[PDB]
Ligand binder design. Structure first.
Ligand SMILES: *[C@@H]1O[C@H](CO[C@@H]2O[C@@H](C)[C@@H](O)[C@@H](O)[C@@H]2O)[C@@H](O[C@@H]2O[C@H](CO)[C@@H](O)[C@H](O)[C@H]2NC(C)=O)[C@H](O)[C@H]1NC(C)=O
Lengths: 196, 118
């Protein structure tokens, strides 16, 4: 019974990073060697686990979080990082155990004249906790004067569009990102590699 | 991550290009390297075979590596990518509390333009 990684990596639509999608993966066999040996992923970074040993390990559950960001920001999807994305959109814990997998998606997610469907959060009153998700659109009070839901001086709408175009430089091109979290609880395992 | 330099380059026919890639945050040693070229408009990257005009050097201790392309031609105009692997097969590894990675990652690319001769 194979884990449905296809539905995650080959999903027709991906989420904005601020509204990142999560899929729980349970009760299945995960062959990671096909993913790890694919030439399609320009980032495949694992923390707390060796990717060459994944087919020999079991986990309680696996979580698959996915979204789009720009190339320059893939480095923020890592334990201990800061920046707009890590601070305000998608945060990994310091003790993260899992893998971050990214690929360039200019051919799918950019459009002549600009694709504006992907957004990111620019402002927040506090940094996200690990794996916290914020999809609110409250006006951000940057000063001492209350905003009352009106954009203005020191009062900012919190989301911005990426505007992906095919002629963007690589650092500005869209990248799809899948974060696999390998959860280990004091419970029976439900996700194992083929070697069990 | 991999810091790949230069990000862009223009060369005359007959010159050489050296690309340097420096690997940062690797939990273990550099366990494998590869080089790929992409022509604009194409879907797939082409793996480069080292040994002729492509010559590679690896500095295991610095976790860096480089490629030199000899005898440049207009046919060499393209984007070039280095790919670095790090995994537990390379013996000296850092602790996990250090938030360092195993796996593979690519440099951001070198856009090479080679001008015609004469
Ligand atoms: C994500 O999809 C790729 C390729 O999808 C192919 O094209 C689609 C239109 C659809 O028809 C798929 O069924 C096709 O496979 C998967 O890569 C393929 O894997 C099979 C497995 O043996 C292989 O035979 C094909 O040659 C591969 N094709 C390519 C282009 O690489 C890939 O496995 C999918 N990812 C996940 C996580 O399932």
């Amino acid at each position: 019974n194979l884990c449905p990684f296809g539905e995650v990596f080959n999903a027709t639509r991906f989420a904005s990073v601020y509204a990142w999608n999560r899929k729980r993966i349970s009760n299945c066999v995960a062959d990671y060697s096909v993913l790890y040996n694919s030439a399609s992923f320009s980032t495949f970074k694992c923390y707390g686990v060796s990717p060459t040993k994944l087919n020999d390990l079991c986990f309680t559950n696996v979580y698959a979080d996915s979204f789009v960001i720009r190339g320059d920001e893939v480095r923020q999807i890592a334990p201990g990082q800061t920046g707009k994305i890590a601070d305000y959109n998608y945060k990994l814990p310091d003790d993260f155990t899992g893998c971050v997998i990214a690929w360039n998606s200019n051919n799918l997610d950019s459009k002549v004249g600009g694709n504006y469907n992907y957004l990111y959060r620019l402002f927040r009153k506090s940094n996200l906790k690990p794996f916290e998700r914020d999809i609110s659109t409250e006006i951000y009070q940057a000063g001492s004067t209350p905003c009352n839901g009106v954009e203005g001086f020191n009062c900012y709408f919190p989301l911005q569009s990426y505007g992906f175009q095919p002629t963007n430089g690589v650092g500005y091109q869209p990248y799809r990102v899948v974060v696999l979290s390998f959860e280990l609880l004091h419970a029976p395992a439900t996700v194992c590699g083929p070697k069990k | 991550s991999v810091n790949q330099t230069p990000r862009t380059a223009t060369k005359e026919t007959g010159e050489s290009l050296t690309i340097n890639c420096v690997v940062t945050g690797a939990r273990c040693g550099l366990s494998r390297t590869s080089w790929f070229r992409k022509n604009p408009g194409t879907t797939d990257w082409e793996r480069m075979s080292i040994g002729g005009r492509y010559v590679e050097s690896v500095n295991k201790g610095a976790k860096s590596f480089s490629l030199r392309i000899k005898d440049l031609t207009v046919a060499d105009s393209a984007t070039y990518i280095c790919r670095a692997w790090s995994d537990t097969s390379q013996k000296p590894c850092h602790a996990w509390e250090q938030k360092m990675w195993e796996g593979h990652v690519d440099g951001a690319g070198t856009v090479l333009t080679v001008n015609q001769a004469s």
